[PDB]
Amino acid sequence: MQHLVLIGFMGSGKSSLAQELGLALKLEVLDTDMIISERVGLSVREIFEELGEDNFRMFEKNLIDELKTLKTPHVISTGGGIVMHENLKGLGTTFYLKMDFETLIKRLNNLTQAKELFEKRQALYEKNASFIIDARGGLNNSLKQVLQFIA
Amino acid sequence: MQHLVLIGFMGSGKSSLAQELGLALKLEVLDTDMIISERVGLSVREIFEELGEDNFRMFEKNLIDELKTLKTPHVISTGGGIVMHENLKGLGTTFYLKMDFETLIKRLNQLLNNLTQAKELFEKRQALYEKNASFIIDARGGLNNSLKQVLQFIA
């Protein structure tokens, strides 16, 4: 009865996979960015611009704590930066939707800096993941992997 | 020969005012979010989402240091958030384009939401801009009027 939480970079297919999982499992699907924006009454971008990252993270940390009180399992897609929270593992079973950076950017040079930055972020998702899903085979292939792990 | 640095919330009119100052003073205009986005090749929103705020703020901190080395004064419009940087005040003379919450919101929606929480946090954020401002421009009453205020303070 643990929430299934999908983490990873924006554009990795977390929302599409969350909807498919909720359908396969007959469970409700939640999106943390959607909930924060709906409550605060500003878009995620507007929240960052007008109220700042620290306030966004506060709404996010508070929402994670709130969703943990829900005993019924939900599927939960999350925004890119959620992995900075200490309370993230704790929310439920986490899945890193692992996509090669090259595909992500279409949707990086060993000797320049940006690659290291993307690698460090990946290292954070992996550190916070119960399971790593290979996203390269597409949505149905990712679904199969998730279902097999939880079964 | 100090840079004229425009700070404030998104939608306050910083971009239009910067262009107008640039024209009036015959100076070049720079935008710090545009510089960062152009270099990284990701929108600001995309940097926060893909690389996180610590990285974004690192790019921004570095850029302020680099712009300080420009001798020739530029008008510089800045992103929300920039005032978090200890190195910001020294980049040049800062102008806070002050708006109230209701005006900001009005400019953004171009009624059932409870904005009480956002308002409370916004009012606290304003003090950070005020703290970091050489001058406060009443950004409630029109571009030309704002321009007039800035020109008078600098002249």
Author numbering:
A (entry chain A): 1 to 107, 119 to 162
B (entry chain B): 1 to 110, 118 to 162
Paper text:
SK catalyzes the specific phosphorylation of the 3-hydroxyl group of shikimic acid, using ATP as a co-substrate. The shikimate pathway is comprised of seven enzymatic components that convert erythrose 4-phosphate and phosphoenolpyruvate into chorismate, for subsequent synthesis of aromatic compounds. SKs belong to a class of P-loop kinases that share a homologous α-β-α fold. Overall, these structures have a characteristic α-β-α fold that consists of the CORE domain (residues 1–31, 61–108, and 124–162), the SB domain (residues 32–60), and the LID region (residues 109–123) in the monomer.
Here, we additionally determined structures of a dimeric HpSK·SO4 (R = 22.7%, Rfree = 26.0%), HpSK• S3P•ADP (R = 23.1%, Rfree = 27.7%), and R57A (R = 24.6%, Rfree = 27.3%). For the dimeric HpSK·SO4 structure, the LID region points upward, and a number of residues cannot be built into this region (residues 108–118 in subunit A, and 111–117 in subunit B), implying a disordered region. The LID region is most flexible and flips over the binding pocket, in an open or closed state. In the open form, HpSK (flexible LID) presents a wide-opening pocket, allowing entry of promising substrates.
